[PDB]
Amino acid sequence: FAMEERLKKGKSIFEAAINAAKLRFRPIIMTSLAFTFGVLPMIFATGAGSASRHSLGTGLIGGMIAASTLAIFFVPLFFYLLENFNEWLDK
Amino acid sequence: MFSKFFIERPIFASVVAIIISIAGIIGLANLPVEQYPSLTPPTVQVSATY
């Protein structure tokens, strides 16, 4: 989405990245919450083979939570850094 | 354009959906159930009585 933004308009790197991130916020949060609650029974599962389900769900939820917390913020910064490096190559 | 064609044809996409669903029903009805994939080595036992 950021690359399309840079193609469609002459937005500088900061604005392209941030506008792409704000556009993307809604879908990503939908998916994150959706299968957050999807795996919530798994981490709280009880009964036959409970330990296996707990073990799987714990990692699932933790990895997703950190993704939604850090990676969404970080990816625009990495796009910005890569485009700046590309500008350095042009010079 | 391939996506566009299906939009022009709701019934065609629906039929694809029902065909996929029915194939899934058949697949699940025929497929056996395992606790885990059996990676254990096959065994052959020889028994003798004296």
């Binding site: 879908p27 998916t31 999807g38 795996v39 | 566009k4 939009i7």
Partner: protein, 50 residues
């Protein structure tokens, strides 16, 4: 387990699709739903296949 986790994957693509169609309809006036769907799909086609 892979399938009851894949439920997350399957909903994602439809979610992005429908969200983009919703944005096209609500943001732009005098757009029929079919054309909005085709517009969003031509915009988002390369992403999903990627």
């Amino acid at each position: 387990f892979a399938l009851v986790l894949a439920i997350g994957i399957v909903v994602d693509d439809a979610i992005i699709v429908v969200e983009n169609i919703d944005r096209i309809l609500h943001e732009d006036s005098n757009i029929s739903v079919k054309d909005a769907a085709i517009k969003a799909m031509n915009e988002v086609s390369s992403p999903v296949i990627s």
